[PDB]
DNA sequence: TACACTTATCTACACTTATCTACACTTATCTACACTTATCTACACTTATCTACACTTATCTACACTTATCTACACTTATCTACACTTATCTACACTTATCTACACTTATCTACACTTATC
């Protein structure tokens, strides 16, 4: 995720419209979806592929 | 420069104060858990936006009449050439003043020599 990467390089989950401002729950849902992608799943599990392994 | 006396700088040594480590108690920070409010989705009603259709006004074309623009023609005035007379410009010639060279006298500049003061 770019969110945690100070150089901004990575991926992000975003609202579609550039003009919208995200609601209080939407900002958290977007962070959850990012985390889900990183973990490739709901829970953390070292036995599962990371997103890096998936992409490779 | 050379020489002597005393003061300032530097080293060595002992005592107490400041800095640092180790140990115990309570407060601040963090996690876990339950309740209620704010955010979001789904659904129904009326208002605003958009399309289609008819009527009259503004825009555009076509046509005739007179005014302004343009050409052609004649008369006098301004511009240009040619010609004669006197004034300004230029050359040639003589006289005196300013510039330049040569010559003598005294003053300023430079060298040499002795005594004391500053520097060492």
JSON list of C-alpha atoms (C1' of nucleotides) in Angstrom, two decimals:
[
{"chain": "A", "resi": 1, "resn": "UNK", "atom": "CA", "xyz": [0.00, 0.00, 0.00]},
{"chain": "A", "resi": 2, "resn": "UNK", "atom": "CA", "xyz": [0.99, 3.56, -0.86]},
{"chain": "A", "resi": 3, "resn": "UNK", "atom": "CA", "xyz": [-0.85, 4.74, 2.29]},
{"chain": "A", "resi": 4, "resn": "UNK", "atom": "CA", "xyz": [1.92, 3.37, 4.54]},
{"chain": "A", "resi": 5, "resn": "UNK", "atom": "CA", "xyz": [4.76, 3.95, 2.04]},
{"chain": "A", "resi": 6, "resn": "UNK", "atom": "CA", "xyz": [6.16, 7.44, 2.58]},
{"chain": "A", "resi": 7, "resn": "UNK", "atom": "CA", "xyz": [7.39, 7.72, -1.01]},
{"chain": "A", "resi": 8, "resn": "UNK", "atom": "CA", "xyz": [3.75, 7.16, -2.06]},
{"chain": "A", "resi": 9, "resn": "UNK", "atom": "CA", "xyz": [4.66, 4.23, -4.31]},
{"chain": "A", "resi": 10, "resn": "UNK", "atom": "CA", "xyz": [2.32, 1.25, -4.19]},
{"chain": "A", "resi": 11, "resn": "UNK", "atom": "CA", "xyz": [-1.43, 0.69, -4.52]},
{"chain": "A", "resi": 12, "resn": "UNK", "atom": "CA", "xyz": [-4.43, 2.40, -2.97]},
{"chain": "A", "resi": 13, "resn": "UNK", "atom": "CA", "xyz": [-8.15, 1.73, -2.61]},
{"chain": "A", "resi": 14, "resn": "UNK", "atom": "CA", "xyz": [-10.00, 4.92, -3.50]},
{"chain": "A", "resi": 15, "resn": "UNK", "atom": "CA", "xyz": [-13.44, 6.27, -4.19]},
{"chain": "A", "resi": 16, "resn": "UNK", "atom": "CA", "xyz": [-14.28, 6.26, -7.88]},
{"chain": "A", "resi": 17, "resn": "UNK", "atom": "CA", "xyz": [-15.19, 9.95, -8.16]},
{"chain": "A", "resi": 18, "resn": "UNK", "atom": "CA", "xyz": [-12.26, 12.32, -7.63]},
{"chain": "A", "resi": 19, "resn": "UNK", "atom": "CA", "xyz": [-14.77, 14.97, -6.49]},
{"chain": "A", "resi": 20, "resn": "UNK", "atom": "CA", "xyz": [-16.20, 12.98, -3.56]},
{"chain": "A", "resi": 21, "resn": "UNK", "atom": "CA", "xyz": [-15.01, 13.31, 0.03]},
{"chain": "A", "resi": 22, "resn": "UNK", "atom": "CA", "xyz": [-15.15, 9.94, 1.83]},
{"chain": "A", "resi": 23, "resn": "UNK", "atom": "CA", "xyz": [-17.49, 9.47, 4.75]},
{"chain": "A", "resi": 24, "resn": "UNK", "atom": "CA", "xyz": [-16.42, 8.38, 8.21]},
{"chain": "A", "resi": 25, "resn": "UNK", "atom": "CA", "xyz": [-17.27, 4.73, 7.52]},
{"chain": "A", "resi": 26, "resn": "UNK", "atom": "CA", "xyz": [-16.00, 4.77, 3.92]},
{"chain": "A", "resi": 27, "resn": "UNK", "atom": "CA", "xyz": [-12.46, 5.74, 4.98]},
{"chain": "A", "resi": 28, "resn": "UNK", "atom": "CA", "xyz": [-12.39, 2.70, 7.26]},
{"chain": "A", "resi": 29, "resn": "UNK", "atom": "CA", "xyz": [-13.92, 0.39, 4.67]},
{"chain": "A", "resi": 30, "resn": "UNK", "atom": "CA", "xyz": [-11.25, 1.47, 2.18]},
{"chain": "A", "resi": 31, "resn": "UNK", "atom": "CA", "xyz": [-8.54, 0.78, 4.77]},
{"chain": "A", "resi": 32, "resn": "UNK", "atom": "CA", "xyz": [-10.09, -2.64, 5.44]},
{"chain": "A", "resi": 33, "resn": "UNK", "atom": "CA", "xyz": [-10.15, -3.48, 1.73]},
{"chain": "A", "resi": 34, "resn": "UNK", "atom": "CA", "xyz": [-6.50, -2.45, 1.42]},
{"chain": "A", "resi": 35, "resn": "UNK", "atom": "CA", "xyz": [-5.59, -4.66, 4.40]},
{"chain": "A", "resi": 36, "resn": "UNK", "atom": "CA", "xyz": [-7.66, -7.54, 2.94]},
{"chain": "A", "resi": 37, "resn": "UNK", "atom": "CA", "xyz": [-5.77, -7.26, -0.37]},
{"chain": "A", "resi": 38, "resn": "UNK", "atom": "CA", "xyz": [-2.37, -7.13, 1.36]},
{"chain": "A", "resi": 39, "resn": "UNK", "atom": "CA", "xyz": [-3.29, -10.21, 3.43]},
{"chain": "A", "resi": 40, "resn": "UNK", "atom": "CA", "xyz": [-5.04, -11.73, 0.37]},
{"chain": "A", "resi": 41, "resn": "UNK", "atom": "CA", "xyz": [-7.84, -12.58, 2.80]},
{"chain": "A", "resi": 42, "resn": "UNK", "atom": "CA", "xyz": [-9.72, -11.60, 5.91]},
{"chain": "A", "resi": 43, "resn": "UNK", "atom": "CA", "xyz": [-7.33, -12.92, 8.57]},
{"chain": "A", "resi": 44, "resn": "UNK", "atom": "CA", "xyz": [-3.56, -12.78, 8.67]},
{"chain": "A", "resi": 45, "resn": "UNK", "atom": "CA", "xyz": [-2.03, -16.18, 7.90]},
{"chain": "A", "resi": 46, "resn": "UNK", "atom": "CA", "xyz": [1.68, -16.73, 7.18]},
{"chain": "A", "resi": 47, "resn": "UNK", "atom": "CA", "xyz": [0.74, -19.89, 5.25]},
{"chain": "A", "resi": 48, "resn": "UNK", "atom": "CA", "xyz": [-1.18, -17.86, 2.65]},
{"chain": "A", "resi": 49, "resn": "UNK", "atom": "CA", "xyz": [0.42, -16.01, -0.24]},
{"chain": "A", "resi": 50, "resn": "UNK", "atom": "CA", "xyz": [0.97, -12.31, 0.16]},
{"chain": "A", "resi": 51, "resn": "UNK", "atom": "CA", "xyz": [-0.21, -10.02, -2.62]},
{"chain": "A", "resi": 52, "resn": "UNK", "atom": "CA", "xyz": [3.41, -9.96, -3.82]},
{"chain": "A", "resi": 53, "resn": "UNK", "atom": "CA", "xyz": [3.49, -13.76, -4.22]},
{"chain": "A", "resi": 54, "resn": "UNK", "atom": "CA", "xyz": [0.08, -13.63, -5.91]},
{"chain": "A", "resi": 55, "resn": "UNK", "atom": "CA", "xyz": [1.22, -11.01, -8.43]},
{"chain": "A", "resi": 56, "resn": "UNK", "atom": "CA", "xyz": [4.49, -12.80, -9.19]},
{"chain": "B", "resi": 1, "resn": "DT", "atom": "C1'", "xyz": [73.67, 42.15, 22.85]},
{"chain": "B", "resi": 2, "resn": "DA", "atom": "C1'", "xyz": [74.98, 40.13, 27.44]},
{"chain": "B", "resi": 3, "resn": "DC", "atom": "C1'", "xyz": [74.08, 39.33, 32.38]},
{"chain": "B", "resi": 4, "resn": "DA", "atom": "C1'", "xyz": [71.41, 38.84, 37.21]},
{"chain": "B", "resi": 5, "resn": "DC", "atom": "C1'", "xyz": [66.73, 38.85, 40.42]},
{"chain": "B", "resi": 6, "resn": "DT", "atom": "C1'", "xyz": [62.13, 38.08, 41.12]},
{"chain": "B", "resi": 7, "resn": "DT", "atom": "C1'", "xyz": [57.51, 36.98, 39.56]},
{"chain": "B", "resi": 8, "resn": "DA", "atom": "C1'", "xyz": [54.33, 34.17, 36.84]},
{"chain": "B", "resi": 9, "resn": "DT", "atom": "C1'", "xyz": [53.30, 29.61, 34.85]},
{"chain": "B", "resi": 10, "resn": "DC", "atom": "C1'", "xyz": [53.18, 24.76, 35.49]},
{"chain": "B", "resi": 11, "resn": "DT", "atom": "C1'", "xyz": [53.27, 20.15, 37.94]},
{"chain": "B", "resi": 12, "resn": "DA", "atom": "C1'", "xyz": [52.18, 17.18, 41.94]},
{"chain": "B", "resi": 13, "resn": "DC", "atom": "C1'", "xyz": [49.28, 15.99, 45.87]},
{"chain": "B", "resi": 14, "resn": "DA", "atom": "C1'", "xyz": [44.89, 15.58, 49.27]},
{"chain": "B", "resi": 15, "resn": "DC", "atom": "C1'", "xyz": [39.45, 16.62, 50.49]},
{"chain": "B", "resi": 16, "resn": "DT", "atom": "C1'", "xyz": [34.90, 17.21, 49.52]},
{"chain": "B", "resi": 17, "resn": "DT", "atom": "C1'", "xyz": [31.18, 17.82, 46.18]},
{"chain": "B", "resi": 18, "resn": "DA", "atom": "C1'", "xyz": [28.81, 16.52, 42.01]},
{"chain": "B", "resi": 19, "resn": "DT", "atom": "C1'", "xyz": [27.61, 12.82, 38.68]},
{"chain": "B", "resi": 20, "resn": "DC", "atom": "C1'", "xyz": [26.11, 8.25, 37.97]},
{"chain": "B", "resi": 21, "resn": "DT", "atom": "C1'", "xyz": [24.15, 3.52, 39.08]},
{"chain": "B", "resi": 22, "resn": "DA", "atom": "C1'", "xyz": [20.89, 0.50, 41.55]},
{"chain": "B", "resi": 23, "resn": "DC", "atom": "C1'", "xyz": [16.53, -0.38, 43.92]},
{"chain": "B", "resi": 24, "resn": "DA", "atom": "C1'", "xyz": [11.17, 0.18, 45.27]},
{"chain": "B", "resi": 25, "resn": "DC", "atom": "C1'", "xyz": [6.05, 2.67, 44.72]},
{"chain": "B", "resi": 26, "resn": "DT", "atom": "C1'", "xyz": [2.55, 4.76, 42.43]},
{"chain": "B", "resi": 27, "resn": "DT", "atom": "C1'", "xyz": [0.69, 7.02, 38.31]},
{"chain": "B", "resi": 28, "resn": "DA", "atom": "C1'", "xyz": [0.01, 7.22, 33.36]},
{"chain": "B", "resi": 29, "resn": "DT", "atom": "C1'", "xyz": [-0.60, 4.55, 29.14]},
{"chain": "B", "resi": 30, "resn": "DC", "atom": "C1'", "xyz": [-2.74, 0.80, 26.79]},
{"chain": "B", "resi": 31, "resn": "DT", "atom": "C1'", "xyz": [-5.97, -3.18, 25.95]},
{"chain": "B", "resi": 32, "resn": "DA", "atom": "C1'", "xyz": [-10.48, -5.45, 26.32]},
{"chain": "B", "resi": 33, "resn": "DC", "atom": "C1'", "xyz": [-15.53, -5.20, 26.64]},
{"chain": "B", "resi": 34, "resn": "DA", "atom": "C1'", "xyz": [-20.67, -3.29, 26.26]},
{"chain": "B", "resi": 35, "resn": "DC", "atom": "C1'", "xyz": [-24.32, 0.62, 24.79]},
{"chain": "B", "resi": 36, "resn": "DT", "atom": "C1'", "xyz": [-26.04, 4.00, 21.95]},
{"chain": "B", "resi": 37, "resn": "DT", "atom": "C1'", "xyz": [-25.73, 7.39, 18.28]},
{"chain": "B", "resi": 38, "resn": "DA", "atom": "C1'", "xyz": [-24.36, 8.56, 13.54]},
{"chain": "B", "resi": 39, "resn": "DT", "atom": "C1'", "xyz": [-23.75, 6.92, 8.73]},
{"chain": "B", "resi": 40, "resn": "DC", "atom": "C1'", "xyz": [-25.59, 4.37, 4.97]},
{"chain": "B", "resi": 41, "resn": "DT", "atom": "C1'", "xyz": [-29.02, 1.77, 2.07]},
{"chain": "B", "resi": 42, "resn": "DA", "atom": "C1'", "xyz": [-33.70, 1.04, 0.25]},
{"chain": "B", "resi": 43, "resn": "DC", "atom": "C1'", "xyz": [-38.22, 2.84, -1.03]},
{"chain": "B", "resi": 44, "resn": "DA", "atom": "C1'", "xyz": [-42.16, 6.31, -2.60]},
{"chain": "B", "resi": 45, "resn": "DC", "atom": "C1'", "xyz": [-44.02, 11.40, -4.28]},
{"chain": "B", "resi": 46, "resn": "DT", "atom": "C1'", "xyz": [-43.69, 15.53, -6.49]},
{"chain": "B", "resi": 47, "resn": "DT", "atom": "C1'", "xyz": [-40.93, 19.05, -8.92]},
{"chain": "B", "resi": 48, "resn": "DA", "atom": "C1'", "xyz": [-37.61, 20.40, -12.39]},
{"chain": "B", "resi": 49, "resn": "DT", "atom": "C1'", "xyz": [-35.66, 19.31, -16.93]},
{"chain": "B", "resi": 50, "resn": "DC", "atom": "C1'", "xyz": [-36.31, 18.06, -21.67]},
{"chain": "B", "resi": 51, "resn": "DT", "atom": "C1'", "xyz": [-38.84, 17.08, -26.09]},
{"chain": "B", "resi": 52, "resn": "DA", "atom": "C1'", "xyz": [-42.38, 18.14, -29.49]},
{"chain": "B", "resi": 53, "resn": "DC", "atom": "C1'", "xyz": [-45.49, 21.39, -31.77]},
{"chain": "B", "resi": 54, "resn": "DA", "atom": "C1'", "xyz": [-47.58, 26.13, -33.58]},
{"chain": "B", "resi": 55, "resn": "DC", "atom": "C1'", "xyz": [-47.26, 31.66, -34.53]},
{"chain": "B", "resi": 56, "resn": "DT", "atom": "C1'", "xyz": [-45.16, 35.77, -35.35]},
{"chain": "B", "resi": 57, "resn": "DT", "atom": "C1'", "xyz": [-40.94, 38.65, -35.69]},
{"chain": "B", "resi": 58, "resn": "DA", "atom": "C1'", "xyz": [-36.35, 39.37, -37.37]},
{"chain": "B", "resi": 59, "resn": "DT", "atom": "C1'", "xyz": [-33.10, 38.39, -41.10]},
{"chain": "B", "resi": 60, "resn": "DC", "atom": "C1'", "xyz": [-32.10, 38.13, -45.95]},
{"chain": "B", "resi": 61, "resn": "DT", "atom": "C1'", "xyz": [-32.78, 38.65, -51.05]},
{"chain": "B", "resi": 62, "resn": "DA", "atom": "C1'", "xyz": [-34.32, 41.23, -55.05]},
{"chain": "B", "resi": 63, "resn": "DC", "atom": "C1'", "xyz": [-35.38, 45.65, -57.35]},
{"chain": "B", "resi": 64, "resn": "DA", "atom": "C1'", "xyz": [-35.47, 51.00, -58.60]},
{"chain": "B", "resi": 65, "resn": "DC", "atom": "C1'", "xyz": [-33.52, 56.25, -57.86]},
{"chain": "B", "resi": 66, "resn": "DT", "atom": "C1'", "xyz": [-30.37, 59.57, -56.84]},
{"chain": "B", "resi": 67, "resn": "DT", "atom": "C1'", "xyz": [-25.82, 60.98, -54.89]},
{"chain": "B", "resi": 68, "resn": "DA", "atom": "C1'", "xyz": [-20.95, 60.52, -54.76]},
{"chain": "B", "resi": 69, "resn": "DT", "atom": "C1'", "xyz": [-16.78, 59.11, -57.25]},
{"chain": "B", "resi": 70, "resn": "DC", "atom": "C1'", "xyz": [-14.04, 59.23, -61.41]},
{"chain": "B", "resi": 71, "resn": "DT", "atom": "C1'", "xyz": [-12.49, 60.70, -66.08]},
{"chain": "B", "resi": 72, "resn": "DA", "atom": "C1'", "xyz": [-11.66, 64.22, -69.58]},
{"chain": "B", "resi": 73, "resn": "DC", "atom": "C1'", "xyz": [-10.70, 69.01, -70.91]},
{"chain": "B", "resi": 74, "resn": "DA", "atom": "C1'", "xyz": [-9.01, 74.26, -70.66]},
{"chain": "B", "resi": 75, "resn": "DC", "atom": "C1'", "xyz": [-6.37, 78.57, -68.05]},
{"chain": "B", "resi": 76, "resn": "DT", "atom": "C1'", "xyz": [-3.26, 80.60, -65.14]},
{"chain": "B", "resi": 77, "resn": "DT", "atom": "C1'", "xyz": [0.40, 80.09, -61.59]},
{"chain": "B", "resi": 78, "resn": "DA", "atom": "C1'", "xyz": [4.54, 78.08, -59.83]},
{"chain": "B", "resi": 79, "resn": "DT", "atom": "C1'", "xyz": [8.87, 75.87, -61.08]},
{"chain": "B", "resi": 80, "resn": "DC", "atom": "C1'", "xyz": [13.04, 75.71, -63.83]},
{"chain": "B", "resi": 81, "resn": "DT", "atom": "C1'", "xyz": [16.60, 77.31, -67.22]},
{"chain": "B", "resi": 82, "resn": "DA", "atom": "C1'", "xyz": [19.56, 80.85, -69.14]},
{"chain": "B", "resi": 83, "resn": "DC", "atom": "C1'", "xyz": [22.06, 85.26, -68.82]},
{"chain": "B", "resi": 84, "resn": "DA", "atom": "C1'", "xyz": [24.68, 89.64, -66.74]},
{"chain": "B", "resi": 85, "resn": "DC", "atom": "C1'", "xyz": [26.98, 92.42, -62.38]},
{"chain": "B", "resi": 86, "resn": "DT", "atom": "C1'", "xyz": [29.07, 92.92, -58.18]},
{"chain": "B", "resi": 87, "resn": "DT", "atom": "C1'", "xyz": [30.78, 90.86, -53.82]},
{"chain": "B", "resi": 88, "resn": "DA", "atom": "C1'", "xyz": [33.26, 87.38, -51.36]},
{"chain": "B", "resi": 89, "resn": "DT", "atom": "C1'", "xyz": [37.10, 84.16, -51.56]},
{"chain": "B", "resi": 90, "resn": "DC", "atom": "C1'", "xyz": [41.82, 83.23, -52.67]},
{"chain": "B", "resi": 91, "resn": "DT", "atom": "C1'", "xyz": [46.74, 84.11, -54.15]},
{"chain": "B", "resi": 92, "resn": "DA", "atom": "C1'", "xyz": [50.96, 86.82, -53.98]},
{"chain": "B", "resi": 93, "resn": "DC", "atom": "C1'", "xyz": [54.12, 90.09, -51.68]},
{"chain": "B", "resi": 94, "resn": "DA", "atom": "C1'", "xyz": [56.62, 93.12, -47.81]},
{"chain": "B", "resi": 95, "resn": "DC", "atom": "C1'", "xyz": [57.61, 94.34, -42.36]},
{"chain": "B", "resi": 96, "resn": "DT", "atom": "C1'", "xyz": [57.87, 93.53, -37.71]},
{"chain": "B", "resi": 97, "resn": "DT", "atom": "C1'", "xyz": [57.17, 90.53, -33.75]},
{"chain": "B", "resi": 98, "resn": "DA", "atom": "C1'", "xyz": [57.58, 86.08, -31.52]},
{"chain": "B", "resi": 99, "resn": "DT", "atom": "C1'", "xyz": [60.28, 81.86, -31.16]},
{"chain": "B", "resi": 100, "resn": "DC", "atom": "C1'", "xyz": [64.71, 79.63, -30.89]},
{"chain": "B", "resi": 101, "resn": "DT", "atom": "C1'", "xyz": [69.81, 79.12, -30.29]},
{"chain": "B", "resi": 102, "resn": "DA", "atom": "C1'", "xyz": [74.17, 80.30, -28.00]},
{"chain": "B", "resi": 103, "resn": "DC", "atom": "C1'", "xyz": [76.81, 82.12, -24.04]},
{"chain": "B", "resi": 104, "resn": "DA", "atom": "C1'", "xyz": [78.19, 83.62, -18.86]},
{"chain": "B", "resi": 105, "resn": "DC", "atom": "C1'", "xyz": [77.10, 83.75, -13.27]},
{"chain": "B", "resi": 106, "resn": "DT", "atom": "C1'", "xyz": [75.32, 82.22, -9.18]},
{"chain": "B", "resi": 107, "resn": "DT", "atom": "C1'", "xyz": [72.39, 78.91, -6.68]},
{"chain": "B", "resi": 108, "resn": "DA", "atom": "C1'", "xyz": [70.93, 74.32, -5.65]},
{"chain": "B", "resi": 109, "resn": "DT", "atom": "C1'", "xyz": [72.22, 69.45, -5.48]},
{"chain": "B", "resi": 110, "resn": "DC", "atom": "C1'", "xyz": [75.48, 65.97, -4.26]},
{"chain": "B", "resi": 111, "resn": "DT", "atom": "C1'", "xyz": [79.69, 63.79, -2.07]},
{"chain": "B", "resi": 112, "resn": "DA", "atom": "C1'", "xyz": [82.86, 63.31, 1.82]},
{"chain": "B", "resi": 113, "resn": "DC", "atom": "C1'", "xyz": [84.13, 63.61, 6.74]},
{"chain": "B", "resi": 114, "resn": "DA", "atom": "C1'", "xyz": [83.61, 63.73, 12.31]},
{"chain": "B", "resi": 115, "resn": "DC", "atom": "C1'", "xyz": [80.42, 63.38, 17.06]},
{"chain": "B", "resi": 116, "resn": "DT", "atom": "C1'", "xyz": [76.78, 61.88, 19.64]},
{"chain": "B", "resi": 117, "resn": "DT", "atom": "C1'", "xyz": [72.37, 59.28, 20.13]},
{"chain": "B", "resi": 118, "resn": "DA", "atom": "C1'", "xyz": [69.57, 55.36, 19.32]},
{"chain": "B", "resi": 119, "resn": "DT", "atom": "C1'", "xyz": [69.64, 50.41, 18.80]},
{"chain": "B", "resi": 120, "resn": "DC", "atom": "C1'", "xyz": [71.32, 46.15, 20.01]}
]
